[PDB]
């Protein structure tokens, strides 16, 4: 048995069909066997019928074609951020300021 992976859509999958799409929530998903985590929003991109999933410059999945529902539901466009701390020396005081 040969289990090669191709860019063509998979005609066989495991029986793990449940739940429903959730919008505007940074949730995890395993669409078409590709694990990811991000929000599920809409976009103005026009998708040709043969196109299933898209890719960015870094070859990261940013689009999908949901079966039996047929919209975009973009892949992991979720935001992020960092944290910065502003405080004087410990000899003067101990108050801190958080920054993003």
């Amino acid at each position: 048995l040969s289990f090669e992976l191709l860019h063509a859509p998979a005609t066989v999958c495991g029986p793990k069909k449940s739940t429903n799409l959730v919008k505007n929530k940074c949730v995890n998903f395993n669409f078409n066997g590709l694990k990811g985590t991000g929000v599920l929003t809409e976009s103005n991109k026009k998708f040709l019928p043969f196109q299933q999933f898209g890719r960015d410059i870094a070859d990261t999945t940013d689009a999908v074609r949901d079966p039996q529902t047929l919209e975009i539901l973009d892949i992991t466009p979720c935001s992020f951020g960092g944290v910065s701390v502003i405080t004087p020396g410990t000899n003067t005081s101990n108050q801190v300021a958080v920054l993003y």
Binding site: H7, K45, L48, F50, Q52, G54, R55, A63
Partner: protein, 50 residues
């Protein structure tokens, strides 16, 4: 059931140009406003088409 044709005229094939023909999508992935290079079967430009 077929019928043979004997009215064919002898004429050697002619050759013309293929300036900007023979380009397609090598994959169905959606890429926008980017330049990508792929290794696939492609008809060369300015080839010699019959």
């Amino acid at each position: 059931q077929c019928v043979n044709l004997t009215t064919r005229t002898q004429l050697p094939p002619a050759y013309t140009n293929s300036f900007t023909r023979g380009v397609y999508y090598p994959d169905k992935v959606f890429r926008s406003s980017v330049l990508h290079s792929t290794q696939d079967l492609f008809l060369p430009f300015f080839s010699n088409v019959t």
